Short mmCIF file of C-alpha atoms and ligand atoms in Angstrom, two decimals:
data_model
loop_
_atom_site.label_atom_id
_atom_site.label_comp_id
_atom_site.label_asym_id
_atom_site.label_seq_id
_atom_site.Cartn_x
_atom_site.Cartn_y
_atom_site.Cartn_z
CA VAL T 5 0.03 0.04 0.06
CA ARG T 6 1.67 3.24 -1.28
CA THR T 7 0.54 6.51 0.33
CA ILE T 8 1.08 10.30 0.21
CA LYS T 9 0.08 13.15 2.67
CA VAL T 10 -2.28 15.93 1.72
CA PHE T 11 -4.44 18.58 3.51
CA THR T 12 -8.28 18.41 3.26
CA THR T 13 -10.37 21.65 4.21
CA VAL T 14 -13.70 23.28 3.84
CA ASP T 15 -12.44 26.79 4.39
CA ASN T 16 -8.66 26.81 3.30
CA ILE T 17 -8.07 28.16 6.98
CA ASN T 18 -8.08 24.91 8.93
CA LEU T 19 -6.05 22.27 7.12
CA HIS T 20 -6.40 18.50 8.05
CA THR T 21 -3.59 16.20 7.33
CA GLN T 22 -4.75 12.98 5.75
CA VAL T 23 -2.72 9.87 4.54
CA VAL T 24 -4.24 8.83 1.35
CA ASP T 25 -4.12 5.35 -0.33
CA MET T 26 -2.76 5.75 -3.88
CA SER T 27 -4.81 2.93 -5.18
CA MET T 28 -8.13 4.43 -4.25
CA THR T 29 -9.95 7.57 -5.83
CA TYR T 30 -10.23 10.76 -3.74
CA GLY T 31 -14.00 10.14 -3.79
CA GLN T 32 -13.69 6.59 -2.29
CA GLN T 33 -11.51 8.13 0.57
CA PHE T 34 -13.03 11.63 1.33
CA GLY T 35 -16.39 11.91 -0.67
CA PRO T 36 -16.61 14.79 -3.17
CA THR T 37 -13.18 16.17 -3.53
CA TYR T 38 -11.77 19.42 -5.29
CA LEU T 39 -8.23 20.51 -6.18
CA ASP T 40 -7.97 24.14 -7.17
CA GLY T 41 -11.67 23.98 -8.26
CA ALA T 42 -11.29 20.87 -10.23
CA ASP T 43 -13.55 17.94 -9.28
CA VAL T 44 -11.01 15.07 -8.58
CA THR T 45 -13.72 12.72 -6.94
CA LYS T 46 -13.09 10.02 -9.69
CA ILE T 47 -9.31 10.58 -9.95
CA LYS T 48 -6.59 8.65 -8.12
CA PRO T 49 -3.71 10.42 -6.26
CA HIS T 50 -0.58 11.38 -8.24
CA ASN T 51 2.77 11.72 -6.51
CA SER T 52 2.83 15.50 -7.45
CA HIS T 53 -0.45 15.89 -4.91
CA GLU T 54 1.88 15.34 -1.92
CA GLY T 55 1.39 18.46 0.42
CA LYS T 56 -1.40 19.92 -1.69
CA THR T 57 -4.76 21.29 -0.22
CA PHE T 58 -8.04 19.60 -1.33
CA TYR T 59 -11.59 20.90 -0.55
CA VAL T 60 -14.07 18.29 0.73
CA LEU T 61 -17.84 18.48 1.59
CA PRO T 62 -18.38 18.83 5.40
CA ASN T 63 -19.10 15.12 6.18
CA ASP T 64 -18.82 15.55 9.99
CA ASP T 65 -19.55 17.88 12.86
CA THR T 66 -15.97 19.53 12.90
CA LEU T 67 -16.16 20.37 9.25
CA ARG T 68 -19.88 21.57 9.43
CA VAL T 69 -18.82 24.01 12.21
CA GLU T 70 -15.77 25.20 10.24
CA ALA T 71 -17.92 25.51 7.06
CA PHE T 72 -20.71 27.46 8.85
CA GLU T 73 -18.19 29.78 10.57
CA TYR T 74 -16.54 30.60 7.28
CA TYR T 75 -19.39 30.81 4.59
CA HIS T 76 -22.25 31.61 7.23
CA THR T 77 -24.49 28.99 5.43
CA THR T 78 -25.67 25.50 6.19
CA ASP T 79 -26.71 24.89 2.45
CA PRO T 80 -25.00 21.45 1.68
CA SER T 81 -24.83 22.38 -2.08
CA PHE T 82 -22.80 25.64 -1.37
CA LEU T 83 -19.16 24.32 -1.32
CA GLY T 84 -19.90 22.31 -4.71
CA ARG T 85 -21.62 25.42 -6.30
CA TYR T 86 -18.58 27.70 -5.26
CA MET T 87 -15.98 25.18 -6.56
CA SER T 88 -17.75 24.90 -9.95
CA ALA T 89 -17.96 28.73 -10.42
CA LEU T 90 -14.36 29.00 -9.20
CA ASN T 91 -13.16 26.41 -11.77
CA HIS T 92 -14.35 29.17 -14.39
CA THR T 93 -13.73 32.50 -12.52
CA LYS T 94 -9.93 31.50 -11.84
CA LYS T 95 -9.72 31.58 -15.92
CA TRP T 96 -11.17 35.27 -16.18
CA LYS T 97 -8.83 38.37 -16.32
CA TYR T 98 -9.16 41.14 -13.68
CA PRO T 99 -7.92 44.32 -15.35
CA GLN T 100 -6.67 47.25 -13.15
CA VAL T 101 -8.86 50.20 -14.65
CA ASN T 102 -8.39 53.45 -12.91
CA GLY T 103 -7.02 51.85 -9.60
CA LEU T 104 -9.93 49.48 -9.52
CA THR T 105 -10.22 45.71 -10.12
CA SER T 106 -12.58 44.99 -13.06
CA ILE T 107 -13.26 41.94 -15.12
CA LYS T 108 -12.52 41.47 -18.87
CA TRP T 109 -15.99 40.47 -20.48
CA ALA T 110 -16.65 36.66 -20.60
CA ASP T 111 -19.80 34.44 -19.79
CA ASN T 112 -22.17 37.41 -19.54
CA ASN T 113 -20.07 38.70 -16.44
CA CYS T 114 -20.82 42.45 -16.95
CA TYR T 115 -23.15 42.53 -13.95
CA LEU T 116 -20.56 41.02 -11.78
CA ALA T 117 -17.95 43.40 -12.97
CA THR T 118 -20.33 46.39 -12.13
CA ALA T 119 -21.04 44.81 -8.70
CA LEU T 120 -17.21 44.18 -8.11
CA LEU T 121 -16.38 47.93 -9.15
CA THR T 122 -19.29 49.35 -6.94
CA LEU T 123 -18.02 47.29 -3.89
CA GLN T 124 -14.56 48.90 -4.10
CA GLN T 125 -16.20 52.36 -3.67
CA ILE T 126 -18.96 52.06 -0.99
CA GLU T 127 -18.18 51.61 2.65
CA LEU T 128 -19.44 48.07 3.57
CA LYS T 129 -18.15 45.33 5.88
CA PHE T 130 -18.99 41.66 4.98
CA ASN T 131 -19.90 39.36 7.95
CA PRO T 132 -18.69 36.07 6.48
CA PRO T 133 -14.87 35.47 6.56
CA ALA T 134 -15.21 34.06 3.12
CA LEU T 135 -16.38 37.30 1.59
CA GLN T 136 -14.11 39.47 3.71
CA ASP T 137 -10.99 37.39 2.78
CA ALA T 138 -12.02 37.01 -0.88
CA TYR T 139 -12.82 40.82 -1.13
CA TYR T 140 -9.18 41.54 0.18
CA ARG T 141 -7.93 39.34 -2.62
CA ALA T 142 -10.07 41.11 -5.12
CA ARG T 143 -8.53 44.42 -4.08
CA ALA T 144 -5.09 42.94 -4.58
CA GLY T 145 -6.14 42.11 -8.07
CA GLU T 146 -7.19 38.45 -7.79
CA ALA T 147 -11.04 38.66 -7.86
CA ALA T 148 -11.58 34.85 -8.96
CA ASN T 149 -12.60 33.67 -5.31
CA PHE T 150 -14.80 36.72 -4.66
CA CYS T 151 -16.78 36.26 -8.04
CA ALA T 152 -17.21 32.44 -7.48
CA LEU T 153 -18.45 33.29 -3.87
CA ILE T 154 -20.97 35.95 -5.29
CA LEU T 155 -22.33 33.42 -7.82
CA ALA T 156 -22.65 30.74 -5.03
CA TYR T 157 -24.41 33.12 -2.57
CA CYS T 158 -26.77 34.37 -5.32
CA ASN T 159 -27.45 30.76 -6.49
CA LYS T 160 -26.34 31.84 -10.13
CA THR T 161 -24.06 29.84 -12.39
CA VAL T 162 -21.24 31.06 -14.72
CA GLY T 163 -22.79 32.17 -17.93
CA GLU T 164 -26.31 33.17 -16.57
CA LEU T 165 -27.40 36.76 -17.29
CA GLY T 166 -27.75 38.81 -14.09
CA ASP T 167 -29.06 42.15 -12.43
CA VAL T 168 -26.71 44.20 -10.40
CA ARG T 169 -29.43 45.49 -7.97
CA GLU T 170 -30.55 41.66 -7.29
CA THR T 171 -26.93 40.87 -6.74
CA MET T 172 -26.35 43.80 -4.38
CA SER T 173 -29.49 42.92 -2.42
CA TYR T 174 -28.18 39.21 -1.70
CA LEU T 175 -24.69 40.53 -0.75
CA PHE T 176 -26.08 43.14 1.53
CA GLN T 177 -27.75 40.38 3.55
CA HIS T 178 -24.22 39.30 4.35
CA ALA T 179 -22.97 42.89 5.22
CA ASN T 180 -23.09 44.47 8.62
CA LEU T 181 -26.07 46.99 7.78
CA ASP T 182 -28.08 46.24 11.06
CA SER T 183 -27.79 49.86 12.34
CA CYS T 184 -28.62 51.47 8.93
CA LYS T 185 -31.94 53.48 9.35
CA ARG T 186 -34.42 55.30 6.99
CA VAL T 187 -37.47 57.18 7.92
CA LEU T 188 -39.97 58.13 5.32
CA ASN T 189 -43.09 60.30 5.27
CA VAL T 190 -45.95 59.64 2.67
CA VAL T 191 -48.37 62.59 2.14
CA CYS T 192 -51.83 61.74 0.46
CA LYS T 193 -54.50 64.48 0.00
CA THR T 194 -57.19 61.71 0.71
CA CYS T 195 -55.48 59.36 3.28
CA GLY T 196 -53.34 61.94 5.18
CA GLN T 197 -49.69 61.28 6.23
CA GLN T 198 -47.89 57.90 7.07
CA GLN T 199 -44.35 57.87 8.72
CA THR T 200 -42.48 54.54 8.44
CA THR T 201 -38.94 53.38 9.61
CA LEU T 202 -36.89 50.75 7.79
CA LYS T 203 -33.77 49.10 9.17
CA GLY T 204 -30.97 47.14 7.33
CA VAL T 205 -30.99 46.28 3.61
CA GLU T 206 -34.40 47.98 3.15
CA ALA T 207 -32.82 51.28 4.68
CA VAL T 208 -30.23 51.59 1.88
CA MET T 209 -31.92 50.55 -1.28
CA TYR T 210 -34.91 52.13 -3.15
CA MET T 211 -36.54 51.19 -6.38
CA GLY T 212 -38.29 53.83 -8.51
CA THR T 213 -35.90 56.86 -8.73
CA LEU T 214 -32.30 57.42 -9.49
CA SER T 215 -31.93 60.93 -7.70
CA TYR T 216 -31.20 60.99 -4.11
CA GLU T 217 -32.11 64.91 -4.22
CA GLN T 218 -35.56 64.22 -5.57
CA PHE T 219 -36.03 61.43 -2.98
CA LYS T 220 -35.25 64.30 -0.32
CA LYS T 221 -37.75 66.51 -1.90
CA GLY T 222 -40.52 64.12 -2.83
CA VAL T 223 -41.31 61.47 -5.34
CA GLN T 224 -44.83 60.71 -6.67
CA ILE T 225 -46.01 56.94 -5.91
CA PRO T 226 -49.48 55.37 -6.10
CA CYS T 227 -51.43 55.39 -2.82
CA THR T 228 -53.83 52.38 -1.87
CA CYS T 229 -56.65 54.92 -2.41
CA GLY T 230 -55.89 55.00 -6.24
CA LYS T 231 -54.39 58.69 -6.02
CA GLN T 232 -50.75 59.75 -6.39
CA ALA T 233 -49.05 60.60 -3.05
CA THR T 234 -45.67 62.16 -2.29
CA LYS T 235 -43.00 60.10 -0.49
CA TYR T 236 -39.90 61.93 0.82
CA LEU T 237 -36.77 61.02 3.10
CA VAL T 238 -37.09 62.27 6.60
CA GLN T 239 -34.00 60.78 8.06
CA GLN T 240 -31.11 58.53 6.73
CA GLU T 241 -28.34 56.83 8.77
CA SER T 242 -26.01 54.73 6.46
CA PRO T 243 -22.60 54.95 4.91
CA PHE T 244 -24.28 54.88 1.27
CA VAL T 245 -27.49 54.63 -0.44
CA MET T 246 -28.46 52.76 -3.63
CA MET T 247 -31.10 54.42 -5.81
CA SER T 248 -32.53 52.33 -8.49
CA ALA T 249 -35.08 52.63 -11.43
CA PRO T 250 -35.96 50.84 -14.68
CA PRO T 251 -33.35 51.79 -17.17
CA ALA T 252 -34.07 55.45 -18.63
CA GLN T 253 -31.70 58.23 -20.23
CA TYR T 254 -30.32 60.28 -17.31
CA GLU T 255 -27.56 62.88 -16.79
CA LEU T 256 -24.85 62.07 -14.17
CA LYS T 257 -23.12 65.27 -13.01
CA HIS T 258 -19.50 64.99 -11.82
CA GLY T 259 -19.17 65.32 -8.03
CA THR T 260 -23.00 64.51 -7.15
CA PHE T 261 -22.71 60.74 -6.90
CA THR T 262 -20.25 57.91 -6.21
CA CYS T 263 -20.73 55.38 -9.00
CA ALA T 264 -23.72 54.18 -11.28
CA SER T 265 -24.78 51.29 -13.36
CA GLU T 266 -25.38 51.90 -17.02
CA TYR T 267 -27.67 49.22 -18.69
CA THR T 268 -28.47 48.98 -22.49
CA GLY T 269 -30.69 46.25 -23.97
CA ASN T 270 -33.96 44.87 -22.48
CA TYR T 271 -35.14 42.78 -19.53
CA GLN T 272 -33.98 39.54 -21.31
CA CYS T 273 -30.70 40.49 -22.88
CA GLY T 274 -28.34 43.59 -22.32
CA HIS T 275 -24.91 44.82 -21.19
CA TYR T 276 -23.74 46.77 -18.10
CA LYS T 277 -21.16 49.43 -17.99
CA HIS T 278 -19.93 51.19 -14.78
CA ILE T 279 -19.73 55.07 -14.49
CA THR T 280 -17.50 56.48 -11.51
CA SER T 281 -16.90 60.16 -10.34
CA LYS T 282 -13.38 60.91 -9.77
CA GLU T 283 -11.63 64.20 -11.00
CA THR T 284 -13.77 63.63 -14.09
CA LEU T 285 -16.31 60.89 -15.25
CA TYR T 286 -15.02 57.33 -16.04
CA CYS T 287 -16.90 54.73 -17.94
CA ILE T 288 -15.50 51.33 -17.11
CA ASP T 289 -16.65 48.61 -19.63
CA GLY T 290 -14.82 45.54 -18.47
CA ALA T 291 -11.16 46.14 -19.53
CA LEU T 292 -12.19 49.43 -21.60
CA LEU T 293 -11.96 52.89 -19.93
CA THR T 294 -13.40 55.97 -21.66
CA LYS T 295 -13.60 59.45 -19.78
CA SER T 296 -15.71 62.53 -20.36
CA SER T 297 -16.60 65.79 -18.45
CA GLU T 298 -20.28 64.84 -18.97
CA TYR T 299 -22.63 61.68 -19.24
CA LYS T 300 -26.03 60.88 -20.52
CA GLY T 301 -27.06 57.42 -20.88
CA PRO T 302 -29.54 54.56 -19.62
CA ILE T 303 -28.86 54.52 -15.99
CA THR T 304 -30.52 51.98 -13.63
CA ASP T 305 -28.63 52.30 -10.33
CA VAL T 306 -26.89 55.31 -8.65
CA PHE T 307 -24.73 54.92 -5.42
CA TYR T 308 -24.28 57.97 -3.01
CA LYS T 309 -22.16 58.62 -0.15
CA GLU T 310 -24.08 59.31 3.21
CA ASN T 311 -23.45 59.48 6.89
CA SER T 312 -26.41 61.24 8.67
CA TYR T 313 -29.21 63.17 6.94
CA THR T 314 -32.21 64.87 8.60
CA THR T 315 -34.64 66.74 6.29
CA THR T 316 -35.48 70.45 7.10
CA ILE T 317 -39.17 69.80 6.22
CA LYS T 318 -41.31 70.51 9.23
C1 JWX Y 1 -31.17 46.28 -15.29
C2 JWX Y 1 -32.39 45.38 -15.97
C3 JWX Y 1 -33.60 45.87 -15.64
C4 JWX Y 1 -34.15 45.98 -14.23
C5 JWX Y 1 -35.30 46.47 -13.78
C6 JWX Y 1 -36.33 46.85 -14.76
C7 JWX Y 1 -35.99 46.76 -16.26
C8 JWX Y 1 -36.94 47.11 -17.08
C9 JWX Y 1 -36.84 47.02 -18.44
C10 JWX Y 1 -35.44 46.59 -18.79
C11 JWX Y 1 -34.44 46.09 -17.95
C12 JWX Y 1 -34.74 46.22 -16.52
N1 JWX Y 1 -31.92 43.88 -15.49
C13 JWX Y 1 -30.69 43.32 -15.82
C14 JWX Y 1 -33.03 42.88 -15.71
C15 JWX Y 1 -33.06 41.63 -14.77
C16 JWX Y 1 -33.73 41.69 -13.62
N2 JWX Y 1 -33.66 40.52 -13.04
C17 JWX Y 1 -32.87 39.69 -13.63
C18 JWX Y 1 -32.52 38.27 -13.67
C19 JWX Y 1 -31.71 37.75 -14.52
C20 JWX Y 1 -31.30 38.37 -15.78
C21 JWX Y 1 -31.64 39.75 -15.94
C22 JWX Y 1 -32.53 40.35 -15.06
CL1 CL Y 2 -15.48 43.20 4.40
ZN1 ZN Y 3 -54.41 57.82 -0.49
#
């Protein structure tokens, strides 16, 4: 019986030394096994595997605690889905554009590139160590693990078309937004006024207007009575806000926003670009960078810096 030593892991933090039989498959010895994202379940050990780290499914109480503490999920499919995405994302290119890590276009990844660019510019702390650790690598120019984790957390596969807003709402569930707070007042000429308070993810995201200034002054929404009412922002406590609406032609003014999602196409099929406000306006389209003093284009998300806002409307 010939053997080598390898490490198995669910997290790549806690390594578990294993003596492996070179006459059995990894699958026979460990269950589903991954080597740098590749499924080696049905492969027999090779001498070059000595001292390498293999991922395995949590098949005992030790591994399940380690996996839960790292990923903050008990979904047994998660590790498998992360490894299948990572097997493709480790082959993408991560261009440095304007001091930011982007992604060269591939497998409809424009929505992921736009989310990655946005996450480098808004103030957000991820709760799971997996996302904290992979985000740090993405900043250092190696975003493959971060992109594969986003796909696993959102239950999306490489190649699937995606929406930036939907992606940010899933990721924001894993971010520490617990103390974010939004107070709204809605004024109806029939029904009167209604003040509500939102906490967490709901406190930082709004669907129906791109303009943070217009949200502060009043937006028109349908009341339950069938009239139009006026909704406005009374108080905001958060490090950023995300304002979204169905794609429409919109003017981004230098200095008035952090970054924005441009979307061209239709609900089914389309392309995201990323607009950021530095000393001038930059349009990041994967690896491609164009700059202008002005922008007009089909915008669907705008991100704004915030700390504490209280309306002066009495
Ligand atoms: C920006 C876009 C979108 C957002 C909101 C309203 C829209 C109205 C008309 C056309 C596009 C619209 N996403 C990508 C479409 C989209 C939403 N969820 C998805 C899931 C998978 C693929 C695309 C999508
Ligand atoms: Cl973080
Ligand atoms: Zn009403």
